[PDB]
Amino acid sequence: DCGLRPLFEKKSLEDKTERELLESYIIVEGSDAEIGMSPWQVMLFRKSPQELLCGASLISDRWVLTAAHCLLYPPWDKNFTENDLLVRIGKHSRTRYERNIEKISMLEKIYIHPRYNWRENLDRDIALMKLKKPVAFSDYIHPVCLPDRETAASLLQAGYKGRVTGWGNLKEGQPSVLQVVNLPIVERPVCKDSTRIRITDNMFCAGYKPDEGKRGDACEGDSGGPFVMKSPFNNRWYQMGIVSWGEGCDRDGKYGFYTHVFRLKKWIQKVIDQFG
């Protein structure tokens, strides 16, 4: 039942910008999200001090997907464990305890990809989190779909637009509510030529060219969040990427880099069936 939103697809109602995504299938400079627009959006919350760590996504009633560098990053002495964090699902407001709406969960086990490369370019920047107990779905909480080989092949193309959501910085003040922005996928060559960092096949970049007029990007605080696309075949939302890294925020000639979810799906399946 993944990827079908209670307040939209199931009622045959469209959100205000999804048409832009479908029309292309031939957070800085984002807008406030509509209620229930991204029911799979998760907030990684640190207990002490109470603070926003990263974004993440709900892929089932028991698992949450996020970026490995949100939990483990030796250069900044970051190394969190199960009890250092809380997962908050179904939110809209960044700072308020949305009573009766959001659900806060504890973590049972964190899984970081064995070959996550924090030393050089954040290659394989992905991690799974097993919640202590299943989250009940609702109008504001619903999992997103993971792509199958076919869906990934036909949607992950230069020019095609995806959607990124997060409570991160609005500029390189934080927002009051979840922000959203739609960005086009950029050709590998252009991605490579925009940075000194060695780019691997487990990443793709997104953003507008300096001449396209439109702009927008993810920023600090958004890492670990989902880059989603709506399939025009079955109308479901699929998570194609994970906000990984960027050089600054919304700089011209620069683009955001995302973890290529499908390329690492084997590991995801492996961990899920072997541990629950």
Binding site: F45, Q50, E51, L86, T95, R96, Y97, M106
Partner: peptide, 10 residues
Amino acid sequence: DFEEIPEEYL
């Protein structure tokens, strides 16, 4: 500026 979450979760 985060709002106090219930101690039941902490």
